[PDB]
Design an enzyme around this catalytic site. Structure first.
Site, PDB file in Angstrom:
ATOM      1  N   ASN A  11       0.864  -1.218  -0.043  1.00  0.00           N
ATOM      2  CA  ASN A  11       0.203  -0.104  -0.064  1.00  0.00           C
ATOM      3  C   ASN A  11       0.895   1.120   0.227  1.00  0.00           C
ATOM      4  O   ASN A  11       1.288   1.572   0.971  1.00  0.00           O
ATOM      5  CB  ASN A  11      -0.878   0.116   1.243  1.00  0.00           C
ATOM      6  CG  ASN A  11      -1.907  -1.152   1.242  1.00  0.00           C
ATOM      7  OD1 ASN A  11      -2.659  -1.445   0.423  1.00  0.00           O
ATOM      8  ND2 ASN A  11      -1.531  -2.183   2.229  1.00  0.00           N
ATOM      9  N   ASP A  26       0.270   4.539   2.247  1.00  0.00           N
ATOM     10  CA  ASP A  26       0.869   4.550   3.677  1.00  0.00           C
ATOM     11  C   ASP A  26       1.934   3.462   4.237  1.00  0.00           C
ATOM     12  O   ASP A  26       2.265   3.228   5.181  1.00  0.00           O
ATOM     13  CB  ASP A  26      -0.389   4.281   4.854  1.00  0.00           C
ATOM     14  CG  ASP A  26      -0.764   2.944   4.811  1.00  0.00           C
ATOM     15  OD1 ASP A  26      -0.706   2.076   4.028  1.00  0.00           O
ATOM     16  OD2 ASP A  26      -1.238   2.375   6.093  1.00  0.00           O
ATOM     17  N   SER A  86       2.422   0.296   3.825  1.00  0.00           N
ATOM     18  CA  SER A  86       2.118  -0.781   4.507  1.00  0.00           C
ATOM     19  C   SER A  86       1.977  -1.919   3.759  1.00  0.00           C
ATOM     20  O   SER A  86       1.830  -1.670   2.419  1.00  0.00           O
ATOM     21  CB  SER A  86       0.820  -0.545   5.502  1.00  0.00           C
ATOM     22  OG  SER A  86      -0.409  -0.350   4.853  1.00  0.00           O
ATOM     23  N   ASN A 115      -3.073  -6.736   7.046  1.00  0.00           N
ATOM     24  CA  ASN A 115      -2.204  -5.384   7.309  1.00  0.00           C
ATOM     25  C   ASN A 115      -1.077  -5.467   8.269  1.00  0.00           C
ATOM     26  O   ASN A 115      -1.328  -5.482   9.474  1.00  0.00           O
ATOM     27  CB  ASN A 115      -2.919  -4.220   7.276  1.00  0.00           C
ATOM     28  CG  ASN A 115      -2.251  -2.906   6.824  1.00  0.00           C
ATOM     29  OD1 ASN A 115      -1.666  -2.232   7.808  1.00  0.00           O
ATOM     30  ND2 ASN A 115      -1.890  -2.764   5.498  1.00  0.00           N
TER      31      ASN A 115
END
Length: 130
Positions: free
Chosen positions: A46, A49, A51, A60
């Site tokens: 991702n 952000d 992550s 996550n």
């Protein structure tokens, strides 16, 4: 590993998932289907952000497992994110249960709301013997 539908349903049932915290097997199957297509090696970074989502449940790294590279992240499942990439999904399952012990329950995963919530998820377990 990419599980076959009924193979996963029985594996999940064997692991204590059917009705865990009120979540039926069909819902978990619907989640795994939409999150990774029953693929344990699945990973999604991702960029927004920094992550990463890991495994069959696409869990996550910011809040659930440790991969050492996610900024200001925590490790609530107390597992290396690598543990969420095994063919054996027991650790992924222990972590999935941990996620639903929080207030949101199965609503933790947005894909569940979008494609599983309020829908007829019977088809995911039909014929599997679960």
């Amino acid at each position: 590993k990419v599980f076959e539908r009924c193979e996963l349903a029985r594996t999940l049932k064997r692991l204590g998932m059917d009705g865990y915290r009120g979540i039926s097997l069909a819902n978990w199957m619907c989640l795994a289907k939409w999150e990774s297509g029953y693929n344990t090696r699945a990973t999604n970074y991702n960029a927004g952000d920094r992550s990463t989502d890991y495994g069959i449940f696409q869990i996550n790294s910011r809040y659930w497992c440790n991969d050492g590279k996610t900024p200001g992240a925590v490790n609530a499942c107390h597992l290396s994110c690598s543990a969420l990439l095994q063919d054996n999904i027991a650790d992924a399952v222990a972590c999935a249960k941990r996620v639903v012990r929080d207030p949101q329950g199965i609503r933790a995963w947005n894909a569940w709301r979008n494609r599983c919530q309020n829908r007829d998820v019977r088809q995911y377990v039909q014929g599997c013997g679960v």
